């Protein structure tokens, strides 16, 4: 039930190892970015791995773009707790999206594939508002939420975070609340 492997191999072998593992499994390994820092890689979905740069407070540049986790020097000693505290909830929220009735792979979250699917589905049932959710392979941890209220497909991002789903900047702690809000607003005049 969610295994963790600690490496004492470089990035590429880590992704090949994760191919064999289950969703939410974790590999903690030395970081390519810098000495004495770590990378916590976890399997978001099939072929999609988030590489969390674990940074020490006060010792790296305050700017980050990719998945990033700031911890103090002491917290580096209990990696298990950091996994339980931050990664495990995100893996669970990701699974909530993977099990959603309208989850679709769309070739790793290809926006064009999702738009084509939306247009096709809208032409099949004009009075229905189709929507699908897809994991972004190039932004691990982010999902595309595509939907077509009228004549044009629309795509927004949903971000998995340890405290729930971020959508339009708001945090939703349950998948059901996320989609209830979404469906209450997806026909708005925009």
Swiss-Prot record:
| Expression by tissue | Ubiquitously expressed.
Localization in the cell = Nucleus
Question: What superkingdom heads the lineage?
Answer: Eukaryota
- List of residues that carry Phosphotyrosine: 186
**What are the SH2 domain coordinates in residue numbering?**
9-102
Outline what the protein does.
Histone H3-H4 chaperone that plays a key role in the regulation of transcription elongation and mRNA processing. Enhances the transcription elongation by RNA polymerase II (RNAPII) and is also required for the efficient activation of transcriptional elongation by the HIV-1 nuclear transcriptional activator, Tat. Besides chaperoning histones in transcription, acts to transport and splice mRNA by forming a complex with IWS1 and the C-terminal domain (CTD) of the RNAPII subunit RPB1 (POLR2A).
Q: Describe, as the record does, how this protein assembles with itself and its partners.
A: Interacts with RNA polymerase II and the DRB sensitivity-inducing factor complex (DSIF complex), which is composed of SUPT5H and SUPT4H1. Interacts with KDM6A. Interacts (via SH2 domain) with SETD1A. Interacts (via SH2 domain) with POLR2A phosphorylated at 'Ser-2'. Interacts with IWS1, AICDA and PAAF1. Interacts with histone H2B and H3. Interacts with WDR43. (Microbial infection) Interacts with human cytomegalovirus/HHV-5 protein UL69.
Its family?
Belongs to the SPT6 family.
- Protein name, please? Transcription elongation factor SPT6
């Amino acid at each position: 039930x969610x295994x963790x492997x600690x490496x004492x191999i470089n990035f590429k072998q880590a992704e090949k190892m994760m191919e064999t593992m289950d969703q939410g499994d974790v590999i903690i390994r030395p970081s390519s970015k810098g000495e004495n820092h770590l990378t916590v890689t976890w399997k978001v979905s099939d072929g999609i791995y988030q590489h969390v740069d674990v940074r020490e407070e006060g010792k790296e540049n305050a700017f980050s773009l990719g998945a990033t986790l700031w911890i103090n020097s002491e917290e580096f000693e209990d990696l298990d707790e950091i996994v339980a505290r931050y990664v495990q909830p995100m893996a669970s929220f990701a699974r909530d999206l993977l099990n959603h009735k309208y989850y679709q792979d769309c070739s790793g979250g290809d926006r064009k594939k999702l738009e084509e699917l939306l247009i096709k589905t809208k032409k099949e049932k004009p009075t229905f508002i189709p929507y699908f959710i897809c994991a972004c392979k190039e932004l691990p941890g982010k999902f595309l939420l595509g939907y077509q209220p009228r004549g044009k497909p629309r795509i927004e991002y949903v971000t998995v975070t340890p405290e729930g789903f971020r959508y339009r900047g708001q945090i939703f702690p349950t998948v059901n609340g996320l989609f209830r809000w979404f469906k209450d607003h997806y026909q708005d005049p925009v």
